Design a protein around this ligand. Structure first.
Ligand SMILES: Cc1cc2nc3c(=O)[nH]c(=O)nc-3n(C[C@H](O)[C@H](O)[C@H](O)COP(=O)(O)O)c2cc1C
Ligand SMILES: Cc1cc2nc3c(=O)[nH]c(=O)nc-3n(C[C@H](O)[C@H](O)[C@H](O)COP(=O)(O)O)c2cc1C
Ligand SMILES: O=C(O)c1[nH]c(=O)[nH]c(=O)c1CCc1ccc(-c2ccccc2)cc1
Ligand SMILES: O=C(O)c1[nH]c(=O)[nH]c(=O)c1CCc1ccc(-c2ccccc2)cc1
Lengths: 313, 313
């Protein structure tokens, strides 16, 4: 019985990794994730210049999940590139580097300089599409023409397999359109579904107040709130992108939640809110819990059940 | 202390009502909702002809909420119009009638017939904008040019104050565009935020199967999953539509949750999933709970706190 996976010309001890943004901003964070039992790690989505991000409080968690408007605080691309090129121990596990430039030219400049390190050291690029374009327009992955532009330019500049982090969609016609855009780009080898559910609002009844400061308390939701939305997106893209991998992210707190993602079609399974709340010990628990479900069902490997969710009649 | 209010030239004993689709499809359902302690009731969204809806199972509920792909089963518009015209006791509470035709023409046909009954009896129209659109396009409320058309054609056909039932939005640019469309129409006097969060997917780990039969298990989410989304949309539209009322719907299971909707800006609070699960006795519990929270806080009226959610600096 084993959780091993071999994909994208790498080997993974198990499918679990951090979600981008969680436990991955500093060298300390990345060393911590490397020391953990996760099968991989991803760095904080970065910009060319360092960013302080939004005013605090900017993250809060509750029994059913979290809300955030971090504002892309990060140490800048040069830091993350140095981590990938000089500091990371690739004999421990694979590394993904997430980018989130504020324009197509910023992403193009970063991927140009990432390429040789990707080719020499094997770092993998995750391009965050659920991200800021021109203010007053929707995030990039909610603007299908912008999404296409970003993918064309990054595919030309980078020239190597990469993947994309996608916001959730809610309408079948959007699933259709988004997957069709992705399927234009053969270098898009993985699709991570999903980023936070955008612009939720948590209010504290005792204080009659929102709980985060930026954007009058509006921010992206994660955790238990979003698991059915996450599953829907993983399965939608799994069915529509037969030549790509899907990585699942959203609502994973247990091996059972991970099993559901994998039934929906997930290859790797990323953990955000629950990892932020529990810490990196979560990965030993998730491994154990997933193995127990496999043992009860007689499954020996992940491929035996990946994407095998049954439908009714 | 009592929760009575006046809106839309009607008096309401309290702000609570069923959410469209729940406990409102048949004469028996409507008589049960009328008998309840709710302040108002809304009928099942209807089409010109009766519909059987989708194959069962098509609704399932869980600790965190529900999923449905009912497919608009309903008795047909002639039934709901007769209920509004001849059967409903207006001395007990106001009635809203929800329409969801499969084209703009179908809606215009139904509203031209509802107008005289609205004049004579005071039934109120809720137009469901989660309705069918042209080939390749998303639901009407997610296609702003189609929404503008529907509202223009219904406003002209109907000629009286009405409201609209909106799906959730997840992007601040979308809130800005949708509210601007709605503010083009002075007869749109109330906005109900929100319909179900579209196309989630619930999977049972034991059986490795989706839990509803239509659409390969994909359907709209309601209940605890969607409270922060519902609050965000209520407040976004409350902020953007100062000459309209906002009705809140989504995730109400307690007086506390109702309280949060009202702080966000809700004038009426609709109850879907938790009403489906608990039955119409929920209305007395929600009233008691809301009045208890008001008493502890020293609030004597809903107006004292409606829309008064606090932001941080
Ligand atoms: C504090 C915080 C920071 C995040 N920052 C990023 C980021 O930099 N890039 C990104 O792609 N997603 C980011 N996300 C989204 C997560 O990667 C993940 O998609 C989302 O939280 C849902 O997973 P969950 O339900 O396990 O939290 C962030 C989430 C949180 C909570
Ligand atoms: C079984 C079922 C049927 C519904 N049918 C309708 C409908 O006919 N018209 C409509 O506007 N919304 C319909 N909805 C959506 C609800 O009115 C409500 O917007 C949604 O369930 C979110 O509220 P909740 O969190 O209280 O469930 C339906 C919901 C359920 C669960
Ligand atoms: O850094 C984040 O806030 C973030 N949080 C998420 O849940 N997912 C993400 O992908 C990111 C990074 C993308 C992002 C999100 C929000 C902003 C933002 C929000 C409010 C005001 C200013 C910036 C900028 C970039
Ligand atoms: O009747 C519903 O399914 C329904 N459920 C909701 O949560 N919200 C609604 O507004 C509605 C009625 C709108 C609607 C939703 C789905 C369909 C549908 C779904 C699958 C296949 C055919 C029609 C038709 C109308």
């Amino acid at each position: 019985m084993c959780l091993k996976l071999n994909l994208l010309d790498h080997v993974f001890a198990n499918p679990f990794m951090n979600a981008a943004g969680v436990l991955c901003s500093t060298e300390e964070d990345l060393r911590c994730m490397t020391a953990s039992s996760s099968g991989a790690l991803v760095s904080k989505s970065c910009t060319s210049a360092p960013r302080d991000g939004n005013p605090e409080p900017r993250y809060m968690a509750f029994p059913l999940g979290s809300i955030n408007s971090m504002g892309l605080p990060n140490l800048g691309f040069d830091f993350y590139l140095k981590y990938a090129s000089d500091l990371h121990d690739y004999s421990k596990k694979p590394l993904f580097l997430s980018i989130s430039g504020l324009s197509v030219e910023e992403n193009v400049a970063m991927v140009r300089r990432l390429a040789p390190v990707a080719q020499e050291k094997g770092v993998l690029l995750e391009l965050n599409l659920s991200c800021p374009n021109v203010p007053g327009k929707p995030q990039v992955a909610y603007d299908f023409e912008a999404m296409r532009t970003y993918l064309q330019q990054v595919s030309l500049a980078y020239g190597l397999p990469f993947g994309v982090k996608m916001p959730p969609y809610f309408d079948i016609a959007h699933f259709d359109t988004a997957a069709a855009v992705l399927n234009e780009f053969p270098l898009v080898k993985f699709v991570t579904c999903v980023n936070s559910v955008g612009n939720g609002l948590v209010i504290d009844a005792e204080s009659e107040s929102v709980v985060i400061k930026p954007k009058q308390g509006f921010g992206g939701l994660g955790g238990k709130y979003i698991l059915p939305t996450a599953l829907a997106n993983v399965n939608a893209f799994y069915r529509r992108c037969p030549d790509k991998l899907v990585f699942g992210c959203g609502g994973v707190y247990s091996g059972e939640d991970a099993f559901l993602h994998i039934l929906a079609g997930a290859s790797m399974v990323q953990v955000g809110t629950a990892l932020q709340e529990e810490g990196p010990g979560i990965f030993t628990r998730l491994e154990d819990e997933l193995l127990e479900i496999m043992a009860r069902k007689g499954y020996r490997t992940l491929e035996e059940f990946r994407g095998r969710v049954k439908t009714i009649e």
